[PDB]
C-alpha cells in the first residue's frame, strides 16, 4: 500500500543518491584541482559547492537508511550517541547556506565583469557564517524517553528546554522562509537586469561608432565640395576620439594613427583642394582593415564568452529555486490554512504530510542533481570529459 512502498522507495533513493553524490562531487573536485585550464573565477565556487555537497552526503544518508530499516537510532547503548541527533540537523542547515550565499556571489561577480584573495576571503566568510548560523539547530535536538520493548528507549526530537530554544521554535519556519528562499531570488534577478542593460548599452555604442566610421567613409568617397568633406571628417574625428576610450591599455596606436590621418585630410580640405582631401582619406581604409576589424572581433567574442558563462551561472539558481519551493508551499498550507475545519478533513491532514515527505526527498535530491546540469548545460565541462 502506501507505507511499505514509501519505506522501500525511501531506502532505494537514499542508496542510489549516496553513490551518485560521491561520484559527481569526486569527479568535479578532481577536474578542478588538476585541470590547469579549468581553474578560473567561478570554478573555485563550484568546487566549494561540490565539497559542501559531499560533506553532507557521505554520512547523513546511511543513518537515514539505518533509521528506516531499524526504527531505532544507532549507538544507543553508549552515551555519546546522543550528539548524532544534533549532528544530523547541524550539517543539513549548514549545507543549504553554502548553496544559497554562493548563488548570490555568482550573481554579484558575474555582473562586475560585465560592468584570488577576494574569492578566498568570500569563501571563508561564507563558510564561517553558515556554520555559525547552524548552531541553534544543533542545540535544539536532545534525547527523549518512551517505553518500548519494556525499556525506556529514545527517539530524536525537538524539546523545549532553554528559552533560546523556545524563541527559536516560535519563528524558525518563517525565518527559514525569509532567508533561504527570499533574498537570493530577488538579488539575483536585480543583478541579471543590471547586467543585461549594461551589455545592451555597450553593444549599441560599439556598433554606432563603427557604423559612423563606415558611412562617413562612403559619404567622403562620393563627396563633391569642401563643406561635405569638412563635416564628414569632423564627425569621423569625434567618433574616433570617442571610440579610442574603450581600448584597454597595439590598438591605441592604430586609433592614434587614424586620428592623425584624419587630421591631415582635414588640413588638406581646409587648404581648399577637394581632390587632395580625397587622396589623403584614401589611406584610411588600409589602417581600418588592419587595426580596427581585429579589435572589434575580439571585443564581440569576449562579450559572447561572458554571456556564455552567465548562462550556467543562472541555470544553477533557477534549478535550485525550482527544487526548494514545493516543500515550503506544502508547509505553509499546514500553517496558515491548517486542517482545523477547512476542507476534506482526513484527506488534507495526511496530504500535507505526504507532500512534506516529498519535499524532504526533493530537497535531498537537489544535493545531487547540480553536477549533472553543470556538465550537460555548460558544455565546456564536457570538453574536459
Amino acid at each position, epitope marked *: 500500500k502506501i507505507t511499505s512502498a514509501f519505506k522501500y522507495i525511501n531506502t532505494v533513493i537514499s542508496c542510489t543518491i549516496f553513490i551518485v553524490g560521491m561520484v559527481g562531487n569526486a569527479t568535479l573536485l578532481r577536474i578542478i584541482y588538476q585541470n590547469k585550464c579549468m581553474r578560473n573565477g567561478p570554478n573555485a565556487l563550484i568546487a566549494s559547492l561540490a565539497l559542501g555537497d559531499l560533506i553532507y552526503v557521505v554520512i547523513d544518508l546511511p543513518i537515514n537508511v539505518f533509521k528506516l530499516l531499524a526504527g531505532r537510532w544507532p549507538f544507543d547503548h553508549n552515551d555519546f550517541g546522543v550528539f548524532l541527533c544534533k549532528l544530523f540537523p547541524f550539517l543539513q542547515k549548514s549545507s543549504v547556506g553554502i548553496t544559497v550565499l554562493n548563488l548570490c556571489a555568482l550573481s554579484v561577480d558575474r555582473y562586475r565583469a560585465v560592468a584570488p584573495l577576494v574569492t578566498a576571503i568570500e569563501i571563508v566568510s561564507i563558510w564561517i557564517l553558515s556554520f555559525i548560523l547552524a548552531i541553534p539547530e544543533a542545540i535544539g535536538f536532545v534525547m527523549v524517553p518512551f517505553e518500548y520493548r519494556g525499556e525506556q528507549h529514545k527517539t530524536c526530537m525537538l524539546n523545549a528546554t532553554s528559552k533560546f530554544m523556545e524563541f527559536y521554535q516560535d519563528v524558525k519556519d518563517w525565518w527559514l522562509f525569509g532567508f533561504y528562499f527570499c533574498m537570493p531570488l530577488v538579488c539575483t534577478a536585480i543583478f541579471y537586469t543590471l547586467m543585461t542593460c549594461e551589455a545592451r548599452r555597450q553593444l549599441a555604442d560599439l556598433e554606432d561608432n563603427w557604423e559612423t566610421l563606415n558611412d562617413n567613409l562612403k559619404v567622403i568617397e562620393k563627396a563633391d565640395n569642401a563643406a561635405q568633406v569638412k563635416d564628414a571628417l*569632423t564627425k569621423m*574625428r*569625434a567618433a574616433a*576620439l*570617442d571610440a579610442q*576610450k574603450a581600448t584597454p591599455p597595439d590598438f591605441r596606436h592604430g586609433f*592614434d594613427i587614424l*586620428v592623425g590621418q584624419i587630421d591631415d585630410a582635414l*588640413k588638406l580640405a581646409n587648404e581648399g583642394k577637394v581632390k587632395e582631401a580625397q587622396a589623403a582619406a584614401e589611406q584610411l581604409k588600409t589602417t581600418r582593415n588592419a587595426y580596427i576589424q581585429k579589435y572589434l572581433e575580439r571585443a564581440r567574442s569576449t562579450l559572447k564568452q561572458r554571456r556564455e558563462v552567465a548562462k550556467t551561472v543562472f541555470c544553477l539558481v533557477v534549478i535550485f529555486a525550482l527544487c526548494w519551493f514545493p516543500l515550503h508551499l506544502s508547509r505553509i498550507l499546514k500553517k496558515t490554512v491548517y486542517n482545523e475545519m477547512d476542507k476534506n478533513r482526513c484527506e488534507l491532514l495526511s496530504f500535507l504530510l505526504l507532500m512534506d515527505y516529498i519535499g524532504i526527498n526533493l530537497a535531498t535530491m537537489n544535493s545531487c542533481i547540480n553536477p549533472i546540469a553543470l556538465y550537460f548545460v555548460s558544455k565546456k565541462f564536457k570538453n574536459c570529459f
Partner: antibody
Amino acid sequence: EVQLVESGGGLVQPGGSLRLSCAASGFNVVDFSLHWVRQAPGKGLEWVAYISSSSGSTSYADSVKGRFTISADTSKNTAYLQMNSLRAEDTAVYYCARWGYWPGEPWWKAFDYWGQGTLVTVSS
Amino acid sequence: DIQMTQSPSSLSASVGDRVTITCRASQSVSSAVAWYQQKPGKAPKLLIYSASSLYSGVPSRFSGSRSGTDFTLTISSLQPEDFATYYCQQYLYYSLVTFGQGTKVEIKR
C-alpha cells in the same frame, strides 16, 4: 618659466595697418602651435587666427579673413600678426595662447598659458 | 559651427553654498570641453579639461562631469576668491574653436 609677452598696441585711424608681436620664453615654437583670441569691451571671447611653424599651417576666422596675416620666426622665437583695413568693430583686447600637438596629453591640456593682453583702439 | 550654450547668466549665492553651471553642445564633441575662470582686468586661467580633470594648482572644490552632450561644472564651497566669470570651450580641432556666452556669480543680500 613659461612666459609670453605681447606688444604693438595703440590707436589707429579707420582704414589702417598695425603689427603686433608675441614673444615666447621657456619653450620652442617648433613644439607648440599659437593662437590669437579677442575680447571686445564688455563682451565675450572670440577666436581669430592660428599658426603652426613646423607644418607651416595657417587658419583664420570668418570675420577677419582677407584682412589679417599671421607669421612666425623661429630664430627670434616670435609670432607676428598684421592687420589692414581696420573698422570700428575691431577695437578689443587681444590675447596670445599656446596649444600642444596631438599625440598624448598636450593636446588634451588645451589652452594652458596666456599672455597679459594688448589694447587696440580705432579712433577718428 | 558647433555652437555652445551656457544656460545660467547671473547667479546670486553666498559663502558656503553649492553652485552648478550647465553647458550644451549642438554636435557630438566627444570629451573635448574645458572650463575657464576670468577676473576683471586679467587673462583667463584653466580649471577643468577633458570634462573631468583638475589642473595643477587649482582648488580641489571644483568639479566637472559629462552626460551625453551636456556638461556640468560644480562648486561646493564658495570662498571669496570664487566670485568671477566662467567660460565654456570645446576644442575638437584647431580651426573649430568656440566659446560660450559666459556666467557671472555675484553676492546675495
